[PDB]
């Protein structure tokens, strides 16, 4: 819920830099090559599947 923005003002700039980089999304008609990783008991990431 972004309470900072309301319709009671002339202009509200939707600012997304106060959050993490998880704001990124995916274009609806795009093709993305996906994969998955696994972590060992030490924190070592395996290759991609």
């Amino acid at each position: 819920i972004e309470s900072e923005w309301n319709v009671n003002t002339q202009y509200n700039s939707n600012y997304d830099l106060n959050y993490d980089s998880r704001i990124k999304g995916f274009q609806k008609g795009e093709i993305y090559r996906l994969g998955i990783q696994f972590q060992d008991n030490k924190g070592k990431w395996s290759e991609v599947v």
């Binding site: 309301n6 009671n8 003002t9 002339q10």
Partner: protein, 98 residues
């Protein structure tokens, strides 16, 4: 520009704020406040000339020794209409600190 957010329990919108003002003020002349302001804003001067050089005392008592140019009963015909009503703008300009 600083948009003061909406204030609760008020149907008004978001307020905006300037402290750096660059304005020119114009007096529109009408008679919905007083019949005389159709010609312009009055010009205020002293009730009488400087008597015996006592300019300081006259300056100090500016509340009492003051009257508009038109209301001077001796100047009802010696001054043109353009030299007793002011109808020029006012330059308003200033800045503010944080």
């Amino acid at each position: 520009l600083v948009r003061i957010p909406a204030q609760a329990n008020s149907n008004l919108g978001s307020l905006n704020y300037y402290a750096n003002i660059d304005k020119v003020l114009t007096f529109n002349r009408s008679e919905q406040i007083s019949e005389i302001y159709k010609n312009g804003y009055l010009i205020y001067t002293t009730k009488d000339w400087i008597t015996d050089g006592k300019i300081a005392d006259l300056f100090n008592n500016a509340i009492s020794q003051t009257i508009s140019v038109d209301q001077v009963q001796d100047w009802l015909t010696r001054i043109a209409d353009t030299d007793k009503y002011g109808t020029e703008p006012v330059s308003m300009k200033y800045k503010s600190n944080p």
